[PDB]
């Protein structure tokens, strides 16, 4: 029934599907390199469990075979965690809101080797969202696009592309509703989708970094996390 949804219904479905914002186990009276990476990976693992439930609620997703669902999630999981992070951080210039009780400044990225470069990319994306005044309704559309798009060529396809078109229709509906002219709608749609290229880039860099932490056998990664990482070789 995904292809039968109206724009307003798609928006409502995606807003309702949203995962909860999780807290860190961080104790504000305690950082070290091992400490910080442990907090981030612990949080990432818990977010992943909720991401799986969310994906099942994205219209069209459970129409796919289990194998195709697995493939899409394996491809997109870090992109999805990152766009979520960027969104939460949008109102905190210069900071990344990993959790309400774990709001990190750019410089704390240095507590972990190679992390600040990734932090800077995430912060620049947050700034762009701020620059564009990205709306919550737009954000949820973009996040579903990442889920359906990222692994779609690594393949079913026809249905996925029709669902993607419906999400495009929904983004455009939101812009028209907001009073943008046709020219402004097309420009903004393009601006939003071009951010997805940057998010792909950040995920690939983050995956390299993560694989590096996994080899320097120090920070423990959950079994789920290790499998998600392994899917990228």
């Amino acid at each position: 029934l995904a292809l039968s949804l109206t724009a307003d219904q798609m928006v409502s479905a995606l807003l309702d599907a949203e995962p909860p914002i999780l807290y860190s186990e961080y104790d504000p009276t305690r950082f070290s390199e091992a400490s910080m990476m442990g907090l981030l990976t612990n949080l990432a693992d818990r977010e992943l469990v909720h991401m799986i439930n969310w994906a099942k609620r994205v219209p069209g997703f459970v129409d796919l075979t289990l194998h195709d669902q697995v493939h899409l999630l394996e491809c997109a999981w870090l992109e999805i965690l990152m766009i979520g992070l960027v969104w939460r951080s949008m109102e905190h210039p210069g900071k990344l809101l990993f959790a309400p009780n774990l709001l990190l400044d750019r410089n704390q990225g240095k507590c972990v080797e190679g992390m600040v470069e990734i932090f800077d990319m995430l912060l620049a994306t947050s700034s762009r969202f701020r620059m564009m005044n990205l709306q919550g309704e737009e954000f949820v559309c973009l996040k579903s696009i990442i889920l359906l798009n990222s692994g779609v060529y690594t393949f079913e396809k026809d249905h996925i592309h029709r669902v993607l078109d419906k999400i495009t229709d929904t983004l455009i509906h939101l812009m028209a509703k907001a009073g943008l002219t046709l020219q402004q709608q097309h420009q903004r749609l393009a601006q939003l989708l071009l951010i997805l290229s940057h998010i792909r880039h950040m995920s690939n860099k983050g995956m390299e970094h993560l694989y590096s932490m996994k080899c320097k056998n120090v920070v423990p990664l959950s079994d789920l996390l290790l499998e998600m990482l392994d899917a990228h070789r």
């Binding site: 469990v49 799986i52 289990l66 697995v70 999630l73 079994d223 789920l224 499998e227 998600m228």
Partner: peptide
């Protein structure tokens, strides 16, 4: 795979 298991259960 664990992911496979979460997508069903």
């Amino acid at each position: 795979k664990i992911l496979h298991r979460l997508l069903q259960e």
